[model samples]
Target: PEMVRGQVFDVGPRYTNLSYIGEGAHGMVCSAYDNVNKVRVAIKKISPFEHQTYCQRTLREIKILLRFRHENIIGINDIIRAPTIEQMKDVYIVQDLMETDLYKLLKTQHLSNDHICYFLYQILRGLKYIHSANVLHRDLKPSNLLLNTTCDLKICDFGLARVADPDHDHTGFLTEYVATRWYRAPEIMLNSKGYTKSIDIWSVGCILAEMLSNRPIFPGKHYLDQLNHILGILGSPSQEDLNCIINLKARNYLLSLPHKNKVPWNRLFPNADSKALDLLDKMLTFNPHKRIEVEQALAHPYLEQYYDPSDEPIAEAPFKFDMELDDLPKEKLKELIFEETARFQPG
Candidate 1:
């Protein structure tokens, strides 16, 4: 109930809605102005009546997010809860809006190998931080992840996350439908009732594979299809994996595929150097136990030699978020400009 103007939030001049950017299950995200600081921010508003589960999850998520502070991860400027007509209904969270997600960039432009490598490294760094916090990010997809000012990656969407306790486990709740279908771990595909932090590792592998290949490695249409797609490439699980997992299923589906676990990396990316190929193998391993841990993945030889963590020479290397806000005030900038004349001319 922070006065809604179109899609933006207008409250005490501190928050001014500029435009509707995007949204998720929890709430709608809009670009707003922070009058007090004279800057722009992303306001995420959630109504309990409309999205009860999401609202509760988002509240818990914000608390968890506030605990961790990292360069590679997204930071919060503030969290505001405005009063509404209906009590215990209107609530929202505000954050510094990012320019765009990597998925959008991938669709719009061409990226070089070095650029991809750098971004992937940043993602691993963020994941390492999450793992250190003993938190499992159940959802790790391209769209949910954000690219901040430094082109440094920030993993977002903590609504599905859970605190990982070594002594005890929430196997029943954590397992089953958690991560996105495409990036789901092999254990999940096998219908393992009990899963662990390794599920996120599997997602990291899927993301790395996608980044390297410049296309989705496992873009399956359905849950079974996704399982089949992954098993087809990574082969069926061994007897040990089956025995360790609880209430395991999907034996026939896994056994039916023409398994080819270790695909030749050189063939996958003809242009990429050996160093990149080596890193790819470590991430995409079939065995979760054998999969590369975040810390080790960050220290991979591929990144150490090819990438200079300290070097950032591109003038536009660090992207700015408030530019959209700055553009709102200018009439010329407000209108979408076509760089080429052919854009407006009759085809």
Candidate 2:
């Protein structure tokens, strides 16, 4: 890195020895060596020029991650510095290189009740901060949740996450909600948009169930089937709950459809035991209003072994991305993005 650019930059994460780690539509992430500091790092090389939405997501995630310095949250310790980002075709995001994520880790090893409890305990603790900052991770699943050999967890994949809005709103998240979108909340199914962090709690519930059962809690063939599958197991909602469905067609379809009885948690997860089941029941409720908040979930009996109210922290101030990243022009977005990524150097 060139220190001569000192006035505008700290010069860099000064990375080297890049080795292939993984690939995605956006780009590839590799195992890198931060020679200056001598530590392993994962730097994702993404084509910010390809998609505006993904670019804005990159900007928001980086700025938001800068505030997340918690042990359980992936702080994005470094990002490549840009002496001149106007020419930056690809950007690098430097983050922790954990051994493996839960999605990949679960295959070779078995997670005990304690393992499951600790996983969920860490999730809520970190999520407490995320929600406290008035941000919603909208997407939380096994793969996105990073884990290490010693049993630590870090929440990742903020590309689809959003900073809360004061007025009621719904971004184009429905189109973006794909693949492992099984962790979605019941509320979002009926209505395209929602306002609250409860959706994140609903996702945590599904993920906890997956960790316990060794499979996705609700595996639907299609999006519609996905809802029906969840509805089938959770049983029918009250008339009041049904009336709340915002979409008339979605409401009528449910009203006309036959009701299904609630499945027993005991049978669903025989080995999970009562304490875990008790927490899962509350976390996976069909109604968002009734779903257990992260703060409250951290207090449940199953998590008591790891729960210490004093240790669980929240962001004192809220994070608001006042600018709509999605609507910005490519040149404007590129400039704004470089500013955020540039701050990581030498900090």
Candidate 3:
């Protein structure tokens, strides 16, 4: 019930809001000053008590952030809840504040080759960490990528992420609606049930191409239009490539479309560096099997200078969490949050 300046609420004794930043699916974000830590921070005010689905997603995000400790991943500084059990209606997640996001940054300025390499390197480094933990960042777009004035980047927004289970036999657990349409992988768009981590690689390729051209590589108006945009640029898939698409409906639809030859890399990016184009080509491939792996992408000649095995270490083991959390009732959701708050409270 405590109130703060503007429409924001008091998170706890340690934090005070400076201004509202923006709103997202979970809640509103604000710039705040951490009295205890003496630093500016971003605070996300999430009300898990309002909806069961929100509660589950919030808990999942907390779990993922607890195991994520990397330079390129957004750091979760603290979690502040109401002082008493009866008053615990909302949760506040505190994180380091950044000046802007990659989306805005790209809109304002054209990045040099060095800038592109450094940014992409950090993203891959973060992805390497997340993948090692057996998690897929299902939602990755320019807006999800936070940026500072120093050009440092950190990947955020894990509400849509899911565990990458190797032994799992079905894609029933996955969804085509996970990633943004522009950055979605071909397999997901075509409704393939056997997609893998390579889906993220396709997203990175689209993002890289966008940064280079200062616009989206595939700006589709709708799902079908999106696929058309991709085919329009990359040209049609060959029969050999179509074999890789396991979805019969998607395969037939693609096969019925007029044949289109592959677009020349140079023509797509006339001024881009040859090495950069080579990597992009590998990433944007229609065949998920042929898409370049993250490790290989980082080691490519375009980014060789930034590559070092020691800099990207793998997680000792994959993170494990209850999948049933998605359907938990209100009381169970509260219990899970209380338990998680105790387990992940900042040291």
Candidate 4:
């Protein structure tokens, strides 16, 4: 056990038995008071030794979070790790505590047009910064988006995020099972060989539609069913869009499916205003090339009023991650994490 500025750290035992808040693929999260900073924070307990995938994801999340310092992106207060290999069973990530996530909040309350616009604006603002760094937040589901009573939202959960390299086609590197089925983009669902940052735009569109209806716009039981749900509403992709798909099987499958005529946005989001629906329409486009970019989305009439150039500053340097962890063994992964921790917090 150790104490750093009043916060307890113990790999063998516990960290204050902090009230459990939630659990996810990575691990459990708890609410705790950071006496040193005199603020409340959320602590995530991740076991690097549990699985190689979990270890890599934890390290990726830590690396990405460390590079981002934005109002709409969750901030990491500190990362506490077991000091020695003998006790290296768990790592604690301390982050800003929010009242709830968007998923839970949406369960009980419906968002007004103003709320939707503002929330969407913040998301795009945050994404503008993220995209500028050439990173894709592959996971953008409701639960990953943190929120507060003030309607403030911050993008979190970077375990699936990847750095976009224009020179390299990442289709082989990316996982087919990336984002939650509901918010996944058409390209990802079809297993497109290459995708762009616009994938995130599609997710935001789904999120916006969900906010208006208080239910997921495309809640499919499976990936194929999810694609069907999207096509059912947005209609089938055009030949031009299909031609863009590098996945032959996916292209042929789409060609064989019953053709679907586009559903009018008005019919889908009956209560949403024209401007909001227009923005959503642009975002939900099937072709990644046709989908709206974060900057363009921010300038749309639906969110232009809230858009401030100063709010999204370009990154001073291109975002880089330790890609070497892609296939590193467990022991090497542990060493990499410790090195990152020391680099971020030198004693």
Candidate 5:
């Protein structure tokens, strides 16, 4: 194992841990100095076997990272583990340590509209590539979007994203505490059957609104409350809109709530650009079928300056994930993770 001498965390002798970079899900992140590479890096340390779901999720994230290559998606620098595979308990994921995430930037309201346009463009551009692989981000939030000095953003944290597995079961595996209730798609909140990839678009809409206004548009106390907050602004769904929700119980929940009038986008963000508002309206639509696709979002007029079809490319090949990997026990997962970290080692 990469033994520790430090108080905060454990990496290795070749790296020096600097500051705590916040914790999320099952991982503790820290900014570190890579002595060998002679650069700064962020290490997301995960105890994969802490739970069955987390273990498999880590393996998926590792596999997805290895498969994906994009400027706007966080990729690998390296990963480190135990000297002996069986003794492993912690896996260190090394990445180009970003200055801060979009969440941190939310504290200050200094960003310009150009910043919003570019950030939104990259967000959708990266998302387009991910969707092309038939994956769903399932979880998307400002905190998960890493950024640097030049406003370059990269989407991180693949633990909750759905890949190409045939048996798609991302449900019943997440902690409600880690899930961002405010940015969740309405369909996700309703638990209406299986998720459509449109969940990501709604989140992108929520994020864009937050950037435009510097506050969560729907700051709900809980999942149900989250739906209330969304309905408050976006109003009650039409009968056609309600049809998208396949779960009878879920549809009933919406029906029970008092009807609310849809708030105009202009009133929410007074004096905002019409181009920006138009795109936001399409994205935050109550129906998943009506929500703007990432490609269409990229093509919108608000981002016309930055949307280059050639640069915003799709995945060369669809991601391949083994369905059987999910059924493996913890010890089996350990072996997979152990074998994965070995790729960084010299033969």
Candidate 6:
């Protein structure tokens, strides 16, 4: 989509029978193939109005993305712009699409404890890199995290990310309305006026907890209800938290907020090591000051103790994936599987 009345554009293949993957407030995602590369890719298309906003935001994302050169972050191959038809803008994003998000994996509840640990470690590693660059990925959640072959993670959806300057007052608080409800940080829930990279750290902890338990750490229908759930788990905020109340804009849930509870980290992480639980508690703390930094979080003994550099290997067989190839003749299927395995298998 060109600047409303600017030069005409070229809308790429208008994919028919597009399979919908998911939808969000601004846009929807679909699965399609890169006709040029003959590989599958995920297409995220925003509404026309959202596209307008994104047009500017995408430029910002591109700038940030250029600065970020990490293996665990999603890479934007190219941007696709389509011609205007009937005065309607047609624009979409092409990205390195994964088969599924962590949300689907959580739904199955088939992940081993080690798998959860490994996944969260990868997440922290990505966060560490972003934080090192003085940026905040405001939206860190299951859906925003994409997994490629070998179960490695790639952080996506930088729409809410912004450069953070410690010297300046938290410059991006108002725009913190970015993360998923379940994965939102405590500062956001508290409606704190100023927020920092710790906001993303809080989210990482929430995501880690939910991944381990297969249930949202904070489940609430309303915004305040969400805060209640967090406070219930982490206990009430301290005098510092009370003082920060003045820094915040509004407080619907702060009035009757319950006293701090002694969260049983051990009980919370029954299967996890003590070190893991300790790190989690630090990250999930309500106070932003006390929250753990990404580097420290990554260095936690639990992560170091449980780290497996060579993690799960990607499966080779399409039949194993329940793809249409299963319908092939038995001999053909067997040959196909053998060929696939042989292609990737090392001697």
Cα error, candidate 4, residue 98 (Å): 0.5
lDDT of 3 at 265: 79
lDDT per residue (tens digit) for residues 207-299 in model 6:
878877787788766665666778777776776666765544434346555566767877776876666677789899877877888777867
TM-score for model 5?
Answer: 0.90
TM-scores, in order shown?
Answer: 0.77, 0.90, 0.92, 0.90, 0.90, 0.72
Residue 19's lDDT within candidate 1 is 70
lDDT of 6: 0.63
Model 6 stretches with alpha carbons more than 4 Å out: 1-28, 47-56, 82-88, 166-178, 191-194, 240-260, 305-347
Any residue pairs clashing in model 6, and if so which? 11-82, 11-83, 235-260, 235-261, 236-259, 236-260
**Candidate 2 residue-wise lDDT at 54:** 76
Candidate 4 stretches greater than 4 Å from native: 1-17, 166-175, 191-195, 320-322, 343-346
Give candidate 2 regions above 4 Å deviation. 1-13, 166-179, 192-194, 345-347
**lDDT by residue for model 4 (263-346), tens:** 898998789989999988999998777888888888888877787787677776666652767778888988778767764343
Candidate with better TM-score, 3 vs 4: 3
326 Cα displacement, candidate 1 (Å): 43
Q: Over all chains combined, what TM-score does candidate 3 have?
A: 0.92
- The TM-score between candidate 4 and the true structure equals 0.90
Q: For model 2, how does the per-residue alpha-carbon lDDT over 1-347 read when each residue is reduced to its tens digit?
A: 32211212122447665666767554577776788678887877677667777778788777778877778889776666446765676676778888899988766667988888889999999999898888888778888889877989999887777777536754432233443558777656676454578888888989888888778888876667778888888998888787656667667778877978999999998888699899899998987778899999998888888889899887876776644776778888888887777665454
User: On residues 200-279, what C-alpha lDDT tens digit does candidate 1 reach at each position?
Assistant: 77787777677766687888877667766776666666767545555423444445556456456787677776777787
Best by TM-score: 3
Worst window of 10 by summed lDDT in candidate 5:
166-175
